[PDB]
């Protein structure tokens, strides 16, 4: 998610064996053909295509460095389950180097509706000032998912941070968790809490609500 060389799309989903093109617009020094790097989720980045001689672009097959007009493009002919990572441009310069923001190429999969788990705040949390509530969104496909926290038939905003895992190595799956923050005073003023999710695997949004003080 870096800057100074915009490359599109930010994140794309392509299934096994498909053909996908990723590209990055260089600066106004279009020369010294861009090298492309691959970084698996948690290791040192690798190097797919070296920086060619700027005459040899559009090479025959499977990974093409196509020197287009003012921008550089990498086309992946066929995707194994071995080529799912983030890809970075490396445009050189007179002395310095700039890296592209990075497109992550992720496996496609059948749409899978998620499960909704809600955890009321801990009892030992309740006597330490704050009161954090976590709603669990487990077993996704595509990451697109909206969580609308709900208290006393209302909508809350701002006081909710969420995080989403990477692509699962086995099930090719995401999982989300939305954390709501309240202090002691405002938490006890309300009765029930609920998280609702509208995902493309749902016919209707589902709710999982609890009522603290009533088991």
């Amino acid at each position: 998610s870096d800057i100074q060389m915009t490359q599109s799309p930010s994140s794309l989903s392509a299934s096994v064996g498909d053909r996908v093109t990723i590209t990055c617009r260089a600066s106004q020094s279009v020369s010294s053909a861009v090298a492309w790097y691959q970084q698996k989720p948690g290791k040192a980045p690798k190097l797919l295509i070296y920086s060619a001689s700027s005459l040899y672009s559009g090479v025959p097959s499977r990974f093409s460095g196509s020197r287009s007009g003012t921008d550089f493009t990498l086309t992946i002919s066929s995707l194994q389950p071995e080529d799912f990572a983030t890809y970075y441009c490396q445009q050189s310069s007179s002395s310095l180097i700039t890296f592209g923001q990075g497109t992550k190429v992720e496996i496609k999969r059948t749409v899978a509706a998620p499960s909704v788990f809600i955890f009321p705040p801990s009892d030992s949390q309740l006597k330490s000032g704050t009161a954090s509530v976590v709603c669990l969104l487990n077993n996704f496909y595509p990451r697109e998912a909206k969580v609308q926290w709900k208290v006393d038939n209302a909508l809350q905003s701002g006081n909710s941070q969420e995080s989403v895992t990477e692509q699962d190595s086995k099930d090719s799956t995401y999982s989300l968790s939305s954390t709501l923050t309240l202090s002691k005073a405002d938490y006890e003023k309300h009765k029930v809490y609920a998280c609702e999710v509208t995902h493309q695997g749902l016919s209707s949004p589902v709710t999982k609500s609890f009522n603290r003080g009533e088991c």
Binding site: S29, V30, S31, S32, S54, S94
Partner: peptide, 12 residues
């Protein structure tokens, strides 16, 4: 092909 690539910015 690299020297004139950066000095006068030749197209490929």
């Amino acid at each position: 092909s690299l020297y004139t690539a950066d000095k006068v910015n030749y197209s490929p």
